[PDB]
Amino acid sequence: NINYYKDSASSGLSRDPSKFTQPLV
Amino acid sequence: NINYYKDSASSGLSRDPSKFTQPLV
Amino acid sequence: GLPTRLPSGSQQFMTTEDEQSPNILPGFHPSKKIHIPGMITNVMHMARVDSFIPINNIQ
Amino acid sequence: GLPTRLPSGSQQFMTTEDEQSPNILPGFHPSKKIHIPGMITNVMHMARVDSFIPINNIQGEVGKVSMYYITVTKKTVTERILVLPLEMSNTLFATTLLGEVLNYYANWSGSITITFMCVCDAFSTGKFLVAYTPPGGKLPEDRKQAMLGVHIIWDLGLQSSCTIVVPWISSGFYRRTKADSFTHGGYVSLWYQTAFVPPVSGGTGSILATCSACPDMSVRMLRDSPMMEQKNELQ
Amino acid sequence: VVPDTKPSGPQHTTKPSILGAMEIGASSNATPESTIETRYVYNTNTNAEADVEMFLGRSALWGKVTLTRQYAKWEINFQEQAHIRKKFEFFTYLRFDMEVTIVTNNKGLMQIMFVPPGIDHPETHDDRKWDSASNPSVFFQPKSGFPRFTIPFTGLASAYYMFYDGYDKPKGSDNNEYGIAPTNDMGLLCFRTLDNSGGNDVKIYVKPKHITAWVPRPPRATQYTHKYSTNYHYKPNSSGPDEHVLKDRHFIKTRPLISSA
Amino acid sequence: VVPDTKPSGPQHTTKPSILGAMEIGASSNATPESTIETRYVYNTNTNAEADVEMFLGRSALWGKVTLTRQYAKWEINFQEQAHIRKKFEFFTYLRFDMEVTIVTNNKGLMQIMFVPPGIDHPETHDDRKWDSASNPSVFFQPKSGFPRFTIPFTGLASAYYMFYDGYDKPKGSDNNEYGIAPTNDMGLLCFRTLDNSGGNDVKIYVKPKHITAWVPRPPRATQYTHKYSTNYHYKPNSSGPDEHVLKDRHFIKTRPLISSA
Amino acid sequence: LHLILLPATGNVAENSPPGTSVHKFSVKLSASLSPVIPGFPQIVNSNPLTEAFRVNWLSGTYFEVVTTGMEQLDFETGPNIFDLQIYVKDEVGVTDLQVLTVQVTDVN
Amino acid sequence: LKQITIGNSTITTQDSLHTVLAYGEWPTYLSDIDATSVDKPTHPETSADRFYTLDSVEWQVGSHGWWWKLPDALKDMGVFGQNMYYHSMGRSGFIIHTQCNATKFHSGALIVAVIPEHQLAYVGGVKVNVGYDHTHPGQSGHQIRGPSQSNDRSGGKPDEDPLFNCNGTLLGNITIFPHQIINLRTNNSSTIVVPYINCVPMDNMLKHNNLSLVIIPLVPLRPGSSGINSVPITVTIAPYKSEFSGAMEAQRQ
Amino acid sequence: LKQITIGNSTITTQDSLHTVLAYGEWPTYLSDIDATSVDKPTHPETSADRFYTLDSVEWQVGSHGWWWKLPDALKDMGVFGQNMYYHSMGRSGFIIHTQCNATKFHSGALIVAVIPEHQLAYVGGVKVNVGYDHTHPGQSGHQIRGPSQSNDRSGGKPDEDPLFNCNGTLLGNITIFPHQIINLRTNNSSTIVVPYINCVPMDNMLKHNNLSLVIIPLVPLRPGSSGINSVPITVTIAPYKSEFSGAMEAQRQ
Ligand SMILES: [Ca+2]
Ligand SMILES: [Ca+2]
């Protein structure tokens, strides 16, 4: 995992359901 | 941080306000 | 110099490939990331929500 | 040999990229670096210096030194004396040090210092209200509508200058340099608080103004400046 | 990975794990262990092609241009092409860096100039504003390589607005602009050729990376009519005297009879 | 990064942190904590695109040339293009290495020869002075690659003069030269083509790196008229009998009325 | 009411003729289109005291400050800078007082 | 049985469901790590954060729906509206209580959704931005009035079709949004607690409408054996953790 | 109250500001790490480093400004001028004290700036280098005489416009330079201490003018109730840490 351009924007692609499907109290 | 040409001029870009804005004694 | 080879699939632009690219506008500081409610990381979490079937699709 | 690949963006000449380049003239020893006074490392340090706003840019005074001051007098009713719209593309700010630095950058974020100085004799006194209307608000056209914003009230005596810190009040995190209606910066307006009372009946004072950047001011997205043109060829 | 199937025998329960209520606004917790008698199944399946970084990070075409007299101009927006616009309008706010690949069939020497917002772009080739000191510019030959550069997140906010329910001006104004048109402009790309040889077609393939999607929305069920506008009443014929009719252009197909499909 | 906003409550002070004096030649220390009641704000903003290495290190166009009979000649100076000249004339002394990228639309085989000062350059293509033993020369094909080489700081001083208030000769002389014309010459680049195929336009994109800026100056508020000359009275028409009039060519715009903007 | 182009500086020559021009200004009519009272704009005060600056009426709503020659400008003696204040006032009546700083050059 | 008290007001219910907490987050105050403007924001906290009940709309037969933009609907509702008109920026969470009760003889349903950034479509045709006056109707809301080819198009009228949610996205997929259904067989009310949803910490409360409460009669109102053909729907919206900064003159006319 | 003593001279003031120290550095001697020429430089240290007061200029109404090049202005001022004419190279810091006092009835301002390398523009038109005689006027300075289309252009005359600082850069941005303002309401004097600013350790003091003191009447001189229409401005310049090397015959004619 090398960053060939020395920048964070210059990199490649980077890497819970319950806020939907159960948004209850 | 490799210098591919073995020279100081061959590198890339390199990296206090108070001498202005307050040049008082 | 160091012996290299350029096999097939080197000078090709695949759209779905993952490569690094030179940052235009260097030194650009992006605006800060605040906590916005509801962040979705996987579109299956959209798929897991109950949604109405149009069961009477007639003309 | 070692398997390599040349992805897109390899044989391209981007101007703003950072690459190493082969030194022509190798073995060249540069001349030595001596201590020259005043070394500047960041152009924001140029932007943070007080520089005079041409507050009288009207169609007769431009091209003259008398575009840097307005003339005040003893009036009965309160009048709006001066309006500076908080735009870095307005010719009031864009010709200063702060504005001609910030006109190179598409966005800016921070606070403005605006310092008003009244040049008059040692007996002329006066109180002025310097109000900053925040973004989204109309230009006041009444002192009661102007005192509801970010204001200061400065007296005149023993020191001629007073600074209003135009604070960073904005929805977004950065404000556009070329002013639009979405990210407009608001207005700075100078009012008579009580008067300007000179030692004679028809006496006058000359109010100047300087602007600079606060320490929390930032810029991004370096672009061309609209404060430079080239229509002929320099030979 | 997805959860494995758990074994379930016959159950005689008094709390039903299958009678729910649609009215509470919460979806069901119902797994196949509630309804039937299941077996253990090792599930090694992933949804790693369904996360936002893999769903949106694909390098879609954002805009096409044609060089007229050695010159093209394209303002950066995901709004001209409907297939990437639908995938972006799955969400409300998106924060992404974008890498921009230019696929041109021109043969020769081209120049891209990323004009940041707030300045005059070059209005033609051979213009004086191509000679710039600070505007970031890309020279390339389209034979032997495609150019590519990452524009980082230039937002004036924590994210880009895919939808904006507001206006840029106050209530009394007349040139008010609904939508996401004033909220963010990503600059523009000015194309020119310094040679004459090849074709004129320039395609701009933009890949969103480091994506953070913030509020989910319904996928659009109608064809787009304009850009920055979210309309969907297509006005097909302007000339003939059926002019003021408006097609809908949706994707809901019909079946001849329910309970027979 | 920039300093954070500190919280400030109501203050009743007898030393005002907002009454200063413009006459002392020092700018204000006034922060927004003096004038209003502030809150704490975490400021992660940087000015890393505003330092001299990022402000000036962008690869601006310094000079254009056109090959007339397989030959061009350009003396290295930042003075023909106004947009890089304004950014350099922000400062008085600048010490920088420069990398020189040549963008030519010629197709074939070109030669650059960096002629150092003090010798005769080749006056044409096919000249004998192209055959040189010690003059550093660059051969390249413009298809498959742009040439690039770093010229280090060749100064005869600790920095280059952007402005010089002096003369090269004493008082009695007649061919005296005001300005930065005698103080430094960066050599010249002699271009020739060994083929004939492509175009004639050669653009020289020069990037200052390892920059050290030494005395700040006001940004120029007028258009340039000549080079090495710092004049600004443009004499527009030489022929017609309005000849001795001189435009100003400044950028101060006017407003119709103060206290109405 | 507003006085267009007045906060401003005029310039008269030293031995100027009676009737010379020293600044040209205007008046915007306050969006009610109520015209100026015909005795106005005047000069109420000057800074040291002064005659021979009389405000004249050019063709239209445009005015002009004109030395009438009742007092001679003599730069080798004083005074060399005046601050006249110009007082437009319309038919309904909403006044505007604005200063014209008049300098005297040196004819030699 | 349920009770929701925010100061100087109280909501009480009898046949009520679980309260929906929108996207799992409660309304909070703006943290110092997420703030941009420097001045100290105001906090009314008891006279703005209270239950303002808007006008009742009438659920008849053939009613296609209603929508209220937020915080536009509370622009003349108390000191929340006064603080909105006097400040440059503002943020606010909301607690939206929708009430419709008829009987055990009535039938019907109401999908009550809260849409963040409901950019409404134009009513149809040419490239025309929708009007400021038509997307800011106040507490009266906007009766959706149904799709037709004969709808008025004068001056940027909004879209009138409830099936496409008046922005082109299908109803029934509206359940991706914080919603509840008022089915008159089972419940009569629906409480939705929404935090401040925006990609910016504070913005102008008059230019930008963050939320948009949308009520659609999914199933029509059958009266049954009872002569009542139309039942009122009342919407009680309470700001919660509302703050405003950048005080200035009132932004009225 | 202030007092500045450099040998055989003394400056005293009563209503004076903070002294400006140009770019935060005091005038120093040339270190051995920063020197190029091999011979030992001379150090007068008491007869050259002293306050030389130039001729007074008259601040009237309509005066556009004055400028004095340095160290050209001190070319006939004492043994500093004699050491400048007899040596090949030289470096010197300066202490510039500007005096203008009128009354409590006068008004006016004077931006008193010290410009390093004030490369003056030509007075206008064709590509003509400005003359040696016009940028070296001695202690008399150069009255700026105002912009006009009728200005003399014979023989490389310098620019006469004070607004563009007679090199094209706007006044008011002149405060990036070491400056002070003499506002007659508040102060009467302005002391600026400048080190040796050059990108070279020593150069010829007759060919090259390092500094250029520029005084501009920003606001005109109102006399008030008092019949005094013009007040003198006196400029007292003292070399400081001046050194010279490479002694030779006098470079006069
Ligand atoms: Ca006379
Ligand atoms: Ca005379």
Ligand nearest to the CA of G106: 2
Which DSSP string corresponds to G41-60? Answer: SEE---SS---S--EEE-SS
Q: What is the dihedral of CA F32, F37, F39, F42, to 10 degrees?
A: 0
What is the identity of the amino acid at I107?
A: S
Q: How far is CA I152 from CA F177, I156, I157, in A?
A: 20, 9, 7
Residues 6+ apart with CB under 8 A from G51: G68, G70, G71
Residues 6+ apart with CB under 8 A from B6: none
Interchain contact, D64 vs G9, CB within 8 Å: yes
CA distance H184 to I5: 97
Interchain contact, D219 vs F50, CB within 8 Å: yes
Identify from F150, F154, F207, F214 which residue to disrupt to test chain B contact, counting B C-beta atoms within 10 A and taking the largest count.
Answer: F150
Nearest chain D CA: its distance from G24 CA (Å): 9
Is the CB of H251 inside 8 Å of chain D's CB atoms?
yes
Is the CB of E158 inside 8 Å of chain H's CB atoms?
yes
Cβ atoms within 10 Å, residue D107: 27
Q: Is F249 left (phi over 0), alpha (psi -120 to 50) or beta?
A: left
Q: How far is CA E105 from CA C10, E65, E146, F163, I107, in A?
A: 19, 11, 10, 47, 71
Is the CB of A18 inside 8 Å of chain H's CB atoms?
yes
| Cα(H71) to centroid(ligand 1), Å | 73
Overall domain count for chain G: 1
Interchain contact, E209 vs A12, CB within 8 Å: yes
Q: Is E79 helix (H, G, I), strand (E, B) or coil?
A: coil
Which residues are D117's β-sheet partners? D161, D208
Q: Is residue H14 classed exposed, middle or buried when 0-12, 13-18 and 19+ CB atoms within 10 A define those classes?
A: exposed
- Report chain F residues whose CB lies below 8 A from the CB of E134: 58, 60, 83, 87
What would the 3-class secondary structure string for chain I be?
CEEECCCCCCEEECCCCCCEEHHHCCCCCCCCCCCCCCCCCECCCCCCCCCEECCCEEECCCCCCEEEEECCCCCCCHHHHHHHHHEEEEEEEEEEEEECCCCCCCEEEEEEEEEECCCCCECCCCCCCCCHHHHCCHHHCEECCCCCCCCCCCCCCECCCCCCCCCCECCCCHHHCCEEECCCCCCCEEEEEECCCCCCCCECCCCECCEEEEEEEEEEEECCCCCCCCEEEEEEEEEEEEEEEEECCCCCC
Characterize the bridge pairing of strands H20-21 and H189-194: parallel
- Report chain D residues whose CB lies below 8 A from the CB of I22: 37-38
Cβ atoms within 10 Å, residue F132: 13
Is the CB of B18 inside 8 Å of chain D's CB atoms?
no
The closest of E89, E93, E184, E168 to H129, measured between CA atoms, is: E168
- Report chain H residues whose CB lies below 8 A from the CB of E167: 132, 207-208
DSSP state of E88: H
Rg, C-alpha atoms of chain A: 18
| Cα(D64) to centroid(ligand 2), Å | 22
Cβ atoms within 10 Å, residue I78: 15
Residue from the list A4, A13, A21 with its beta carbon closest to the beta carbon of C49: A21
Identify from F59, F83, F100, F140 which residue to disrupt to test chain E contact, counting E C-beta atoms within 10 A and taking the largest count.
Answer: F83
CA distance E51 to C43: 6
Characterize the bridge pairing of strands H107-116 and G42-43: unpaired
Instruction: Report the residue of chain C nearest A1, measured CA to CA.
Output: C20
Identify from A11, A13, A14 which residue to disrupt to test chain E contact, counting E C-beta atoms within 10 A and taking the largest count.
Answer: A13
By the 8 A CB rule, do E67 and E106 touch? yes
**Domains (range + CATH), chain D:** 1-235 (2.60.120.20)
- Report chain G residues whose CB lies below 8 A from the CB of F258: 7
Interchain contact, C52 vs H175, CB within 8 Å: yes
The closest of I112, I114, I152, I111 to I134, measured between CA atoms, is: I152
CA angle E15, E16, E21 (to 5 degrees): 115
Nearest chain H CA: its distance from A23 CA (Å): 5
Cβ atoms within 10 Å, residue E80: 16
Q: Which residue has the tokens 């910066």?
A: D185
| Cα(B18) to centroid(ligand 2), Å | 46
Dihedrals phi, psi of H164, to nearest 5 degrees: -95, 20
By the 8 A CB rule, do E114 and E189 touch? yes
Structure tokens at F256: 């119709």
Which DSSP string corresponds to G59-103? Answer: SSSEEEEE--SSS---SSSS--EEEEEEEE-BSS---EEEEEEEE
What is the identity of the amino acid at B16?
A: D
Cβ atoms within 10 Å, residue I202: 22
Q: How far is CA D202 from CA D119, G63, G85, G99, H115, in A?
A: 16, 21, 8, 9, 64
Nearest chain A CA: its distance from C38 CA (Å): 7
Instruction: Report the residue of chain E nearest D15, measured CA to CA.
Output: E137
What would the 3-class secondary structure string for chain F be?
CCCCECCCCCCCCCCCCCCCCHHHCCCCCCCHHHHCCECCECCCCCCCCCEHHHHHCCCEEEEEEECCCCEEEEECCCCCCHHHHHHHCCECEEEEEEEEEEEECCCCCEEEEEECCCCCCCCCCCCHHHCCCCCCEEEECCCCCCCEEEECCCCCCCCEECCCCECCCCCCCCCCCCCCCCCCCCCEEEEEECCCCCCCEEEEEEEEEEEEECCECCCECECCCCCCCCCCCECCCCCCCCCCCCECCECCCCCCCCCCC
By the 8 A CB rule, do B19 and I23 touch? yes
Identify from C24, C29, C35 which residue to disrupt to test chain F contact, counting F C-beta atoms within 10 A and taking the largest count.
Answer: C29
The closest of I104, I140, I135 to I235, measured between CA atoms, is: I140
Whether there are 3 or more C-beta pairs closer than 8 Å between F and H is yes
Nearest chain H CA: its distance from C4 CA (Å): 47
By a Cβ cutoff of 8 Å, what residues of chain C touch chain D? 2-7, 9-11, 13, 17, 19-22, 24-29, 31-32
The closest of I220, F250, I145 to D68, measured between CA atoms, is: I220
By the 8 A CB rule, do I219 and I109 touch? yes
**Domains (range + CATH), chain F:** 1-261 (2.60.120.20)
Q: Where are the domains of chain I?
A: 1-253
Interchain contact, D218 vs C32, CB within 8 Å: no
Instruction: Report the residue of chain C nearest D220, measured CA to CA.
Output: C28
- Reported as type and span, the H/E element at residue E146 is none
What is the identity of the amino acid at E98?
A: M
Interchain contact, G5 vs D75, CB within 8 Å: no
Which residues are D210's β-sheet partners? D52, D115
Documented resolution in Å: 3.2
Experimental method: cryo-EM
CA distance D107 to F142: 37
Longest dimension (CA), chain C: 72
| Cα(D71) to centroid(ligand 1), Å | 28
The closest of E165, E214, F9, E157 to H34, measured between CA atoms, is: E157
Interchain contact, B25 vs I19, CB within 8 Å: yes
DSSP state of E218: P
Structure tokens at I192: 């600026």
Q: Is C25 left (phi over 0), alpha (psi -120 to 50) or beta?
A: left
CA distance H239 to H48: 7
Interface of D with H in 184-213 (CB under 8 A): none
Interchain contact, D45 vs B20, CB within 8 Å: yes
Nearest chain F CA: its distance from H27 CA (Å): 20
Q: Is I1-253 in CATH node 2.60.120.20? A: yes
Which residues are F91's β-sheet partners? F216
Interchain contact, G106 vs I60, CB within 8 Å: yes
Structure tokens at E76: 């950066």
- Report chain C residues whose CB lies below 8 A from the CB of H23: 37-38
By the 8 A CB rule, do D220 and D105 touch? yes
Is the CB of E141 inside 8 Å of chain F's CB atoms?
yes
Is the CB of H195 inside 8 Å of chain C's CB atoms?
yes
How many residues are there in chain E?
261
